[PDB]
């Protein structure tokens, strides 16, 4: 949509897109994560996290390492640019971020930090 994307995380851990293109015109960008299916947060929770492609592994490891209670995102982790909370089936959440935080020509990956989910739930964000 205009400066927004509606992305989904389903019970067979996949995202409904794998490519997000944020236009330079947008001053803010909004992602609305929604979760269809019936499998609950502790078994198939999802979240939308944004970092540079280089930082990704690290955010994922230190988030995995931090636990359900901390929604698998290490607290005040400087590498995560924007993130939603972890949601189970039937939940929704959105995050708007400053597009001026995205550097032109850098590689940004979006992903889900919940254990084992990044292997299929992750894609690219490109700021044109
Ligand atoms: Cu996930």
PDB file of C-alpha atoms and ligand atoms in Angstrom:
ATOM      1  CA  UNK A   1       0.000   0.000   0.000  1.00  0.00           C
ATOM      2  CA  UNK A   2       1.176   3.676   0.196  1.00  0.00           C
ATOM      3  CA  UNK A   3       4.148   3.642   2.604  1.00  0.00           C
ATOM      4  CA  UNK A   4       2.804   0.487   4.194  1.00  0.00           C
ATOM      5  CA  UNK A   5       3.040  -3.253   3.672  1.00  0.00           C
ATOM      6  CA  UNK A   6       0.719  -5.953   5.153  1.00  0.00           C
ATOM      7  CA  UNK A   7       2.728  -9.026   5.706  1.00  0.00           C
ATOM      8  CA  UNK A   8       1.688 -12.352   7.275  1.00  0.00           C
ATOM      9  CA  UNK A   9       3.182 -15.006   9.350  1.00  0.00           C
ATOM     10  CA  UNK A  10       1.355 -18.283   9.190  1.00  0.00           C
ATOM     11  CA  UNK A  11       1.385 -21.551  11.053  1.00  0.00           C
ATOM     12  CA  UNK A  12       3.886 -23.128   8.649  1.00  0.00           C
ATOM     13  CA  UNK A  13       6.337 -20.328   9.287  1.00  0.00           C
ATOM     14  CA  UNK A  14       6.471 -18.413   6.065  1.00  0.00           C
ATOM     15  CA  UNK A  15       6.037 -14.781   5.181  1.00  0.00           C
ATOM     16  CA  UNK A  16       3.551 -13.802   2.397  1.00  0.00           C
ATOM     17  CA  UNK A  17       6.237 -11.720   0.606  1.00  0.00           C
ATOM     18  CA  UNK A  18      10.004 -11.754   0.598  1.00  0.00           C
ATOM     19  CA  UNK A  19      10.734  -8.380  -0.897  1.00  0.00           C
ATOM     20  CA  UNK A  20       9.750  -4.984   0.560  1.00  0.00           C
ATOM     21  CA  UNK A  21      10.547  -1.820  -1.371  1.00  0.00           C
ATOM     22  CA  UNK A  22      10.352   1.376   0.606  1.00  0.00           C
ATOM     23  CA  UNK A  23      10.210   4.476  -1.558  1.00  0.00           C
ATOM     24  CA  UNK A  24      12.472   7.443  -0.664  1.00  0.00           C
ATOM     25  CA  UNK A  25       9.395   9.732  -0.786  1.00  0.00           C
ATOM     26  CA  UNK A  26       7.959   8.044   2.302  1.00  0.00           C
ATOM     27  CA  UNK A  27       9.078   9.843   5.448  1.00  0.00           C
ATOM     28  CA  UNK A  28       7.787   6.974   7.623  1.00  0.00           C
ATOM     29  CA  UNK A  29       7.093   3.369   6.622  1.00  0.00           C
ATOM     30  CA  UNK A  30       4.562   1.049   8.259  1.00  0.00           C
ATOM     31  CA  UNK A  31       4.441  -2.712   8.419  1.00  0.00           C
ATOM     32  CA  UNK A  32       1.356  -4.399   9.768  1.00  0.00           C
ATOM     33  CA  UNK A  33       2.199  -7.960  10.760  1.00  0.00           C
ATOM     34  CA  UNK A  34      -0.746 -10.333  11.045  1.00  0.00           C
ATOM     35  CA  UNK A  35      -0.847 -14.037  12.002  1.00  0.00           C
ATOM     36  CA  UNK A  36      -3.377 -16.487  10.479  1.00  0.00           C
ATOM     37  CA  UNK A  37      -3.701 -20.135  11.555  1.00  0.00           C
ATOM     38  CA  UNK A  38      -4.418 -21.546  15.027  1.00  0.00           C
ATOM     39  CA  UNK A  39      -0.997 -22.356  16.548  1.00  0.00           C
ATOM     40  CA  UNK A  40      -0.191 -20.305  19.659  1.00  0.00           C
ATOM     41  CA  UNK A  41       2.672 -17.901  20.438  1.00  0.00           C
ATOM     42  CA  UNK A  42       4.935 -20.288  22.374  1.00  0.00           C
ATOM     43  CA  UNK A  43       4.738 -22.759  19.469  1.00  0.00           C
ATOM     44  CA  UNK A  44       4.607 -20.477  16.357  1.00  0.00           C
ATOM     45  CA  UNK A  45       5.037 -16.878  17.351  1.00  0.00           C
ATOM     46  CA  UNK A  46       6.231 -14.370  14.764  1.00  0.00           C
ATOM     47  CA  UNK A  47       7.606 -10.860  14.712  1.00  0.00           C
ATOM     48  CA  UNK A  48       8.962  -8.553  11.948  1.00  0.00           C
ATOM     49  CA  UNK A  49      12.581  -7.393  12.658  1.00  0.00           C
ATOM     50  CA  UNK A  50      14.681  -5.160  10.466  1.00  0.00           C
ATOM     51  CA  UNK A  51      18.484  -4.976  10.526  1.00  0.00           C
ATOM     52  CA  UNK A  52      21.297  -4.666   7.983  1.00  0.00           C
ATOM     53  CA  UNK A  53      22.059  -7.938   6.263  1.00  0.00           C
ATOM     54  CA  UNK A  54      25.427  -8.081   8.067  1.00  0.00           C
ATOM     55  CA  UNK A  55      23.948  -7.678  11.522  1.00  0.00           C
ATOM     56  CA  UNK A  56      21.031 -10.200  10.965  1.00  0.00           C
ATOM     57  CA  UNK A  57      22.746 -13.373  12.278  1.00  0.00           C
ATOM     58  CA  UNK A  58      23.739 -11.556  15.438  1.00  0.00           C
ATOM     59  CA  UNK A  59      20.300 -10.094  16.202  1.00  0.00           C
ATOM     60  CA  UNK A  60      18.877 -13.580  15.551  1.00  0.00           C
ATOM     61  CA  UNK A  61      21.364 -15.365  17.856  1.00  0.00           C
ATOM     62  CA  UNK A  62      21.159 -12.863  20.684  1.00  0.00           C
ATOM     63  CA  UNK A  63      17.367 -12.668  20.332  1.00  0.00           C
ATOM     64  CA  UNK A  64      17.030 -16.516  20.385  1.00  0.00           C
ATOM     65  CA  UNK A  65      19.315 -16.527  23.354  1.00  0.00           C
ATOM     66  CA  UNK A  66      17.078 -14.000  25.210  1.00  0.00           C
ATOM     67  CA  UNK A  67      13.775 -15.956  25.375  1.00  0.00           C
ATOM     68  CA  UNK A  68      10.048 -15.947  25.009  1.00  0.00           C
ATOM     69  CA  UNK A  69       9.624 -13.583  27.915  1.00  0.00           C
ATOM     70  CA  UNK A  70      11.834 -11.034  26.104  1.00  0.00           C
ATOM     71  CA  UNK A  71       9.971 -11.849  22.773  1.00  0.00           C
ATOM     72  CA  UNK A  72      13.210 -13.201  21.403  1.00  0.00           C
ATOM     73  CA  UNK A  73      14.699  -9.718  20.844  1.00  0.00           C
ATOM     74  CA  UNK A  74      17.745  -8.790  22.991  1.00  0.00           C
ATOM     75  CA  UNK A  75      16.800  -5.649  25.003  1.00  0.00           C
ATOM     76  CA  UNK A  76      17.875  -2.293  23.569  1.00  0.00           C
ATOM     77  CA  UNK A  77      19.760  -4.048  20.821  1.00  0.00           C
ATOM     78  CA  UNK A  78      21.358  -1.306  18.775  1.00  0.00           C
ATOM     79  CA  UNK A  79      21.212  -3.350  15.494  1.00  0.00           C
ATOM     80  CA  UNK A  80      17.490  -3.688  15.093  1.00  0.00           C
ATOM     81  CA  UNK A  81      16.196  -0.642  13.223  1.00  0.00           C
ATOM     82  CA  UNK A  82      12.474  -1.360  13.761  1.00  0.00           C
ATOM     83  CA  UNK A  83      10.584  -4.456  15.015  1.00  0.00           C
ATOM     84  CA  UNK A  84       6.981  -5.466  15.893  1.00  0.00           C
ATOM     85  CA  UNK A  85       6.300  -7.556  19.102  1.00  0.00           C
ATOM     86  CA  UNK A  86       5.954 -11.351  18.856  1.00  0.00           C
ATOM     87  CA  UNK A  87       2.308 -12.343  18.141  1.00  0.00           C
ATOM     88  CA  UNK A  88       0.489 -15.701  18.075  1.00  0.00           C
ATOM     89  CA  UNK A  89      -2.459 -16.689  15.898  1.00  0.00           C
ATOM     90  CA  UNK A  90      -5.118 -14.052  15.504  1.00  0.00           C
ATOM     91  CA  UNK A  91      -2.878 -11.214  16.699  1.00  0.00           C
ATOM     92  CA  UNK A  92      -1.859  -8.197  14.745  1.00  0.00           C
ATOM     93  CA  UNK A  93       0.704  -5.367  15.401  1.00  0.00           C
ATOM     94  CA  UNK A  94       2.344  -2.667  13.349  1.00  0.00           C
ATOM     95  CA  UNK A  95       5.586  -0.618  13.564  1.00  0.00           C
ATOM     96  CA  UNK A  96       6.186   2.620  11.754  1.00  0.00           C
ATOM     97  CA  UNK A  97       9.922   3.661  11.460  1.00  0.00           C
ATOM     98  CA  UNK A  98      11.864   6.695  10.108  1.00  0.00           C
ATOM     99  CA  UNK A  99      12.781   6.121   6.504  1.00  0.00           C
ATOM    100  CA  UNK A 100      15.788   8.434   7.066  1.00  0.00           C
ATOM    101  CA  UNK A 101      17.275   5.635   9.140  1.00  0.00           C
ATOM    102  CA  UNK A 102      17.701   3.587   5.992  1.00  0.00           C
ATOM    103  CA  UNK A 103      20.893   4.321   4.207  1.00  0.00           C
ATOM    104  CA  UNK A 104      20.833   4.366   0.408  1.00  0.00           C
ATOM    105  CA  UNK A 105      22.721   1.503  -1.088  1.00  0.00           C
ATOM    106  CA  UNK A 106      22.896  -0.577   2.139  1.00  0.00           C
ATOM    107  CA  UNK A 107      21.443  -4.153   2.266  1.00  0.00           C
ATOM    108  CA  UNK A 108      18.586  -4.555   4.717  1.00  0.00           C
ATOM    109  CA  UNK A 109      17.040  -7.841   5.577  1.00  0.00           C
ATOM    110  CA  UNK A 110      13.833  -8.316   7.450  1.00  0.00           C
ATOM    111  CA  UNK A 111      13.297 -11.497   9.458  1.00  0.00           C
ATOM    112  CA  UNK A 112      11.535 -13.319  12.301  1.00  0.00           C
ATOM    113  CA  UNK A 113      13.730 -14.067  15.397  1.00  0.00           C
ATOM    114  CA  UNK A 114      11.692 -16.885  16.995  1.00  0.00           C
ATOM    115  CA  UNK A 115      13.741 -20.160  17.021  1.00  0.00           C
ATOM    116  CA  UNK A 116      14.300 -21.661  13.562  1.00  0.00           C
ATOM    117  CA  UNK A 117      11.962 -19.254  11.771  1.00  0.00           C
ATOM    118  CA  UNK A 118      14.582 -17.060   9.896  1.00  0.00           C
ATOM    119  CA  UNK A 119      15.614 -19.958   7.706  1.00  0.00           C
ATOM    120  CA  UNK A 120      12.350 -19.407   5.690  1.00  0.00           C
ATOM    121  CA  UNK A 121      10.870 -16.157   7.236  1.00  0.00           C
ATOM    122  CA  UNK A 122      13.239 -13.446   6.089  1.00  0.00           C
ATOM    123  CA  UNK A 123      13.413 -11.335   2.927  1.00  0.00           C
ATOM    124  CA  UNK A 124      14.888  -8.109   1.590  1.00  0.00           C
ATOM    125  CA  UNK A 125      13.835  -4.514   2.097  1.00  0.00           C
ATOM    126  CA  UNK A 126      15.160  -2.101  -0.512  1.00  0.00           C
ATOM    127  CA  UNK A 127      14.954   1.687  -0.177  1.00  0.00           C
ATOM    128  CA  UNK A 128      14.599   3.160  -3.687  1.00  0.00           C
TER     129      UNK A 128
HETATM  130 CU1  LIG B   1       8.411 -16.515  12.944  1.00  0.00          CU
END
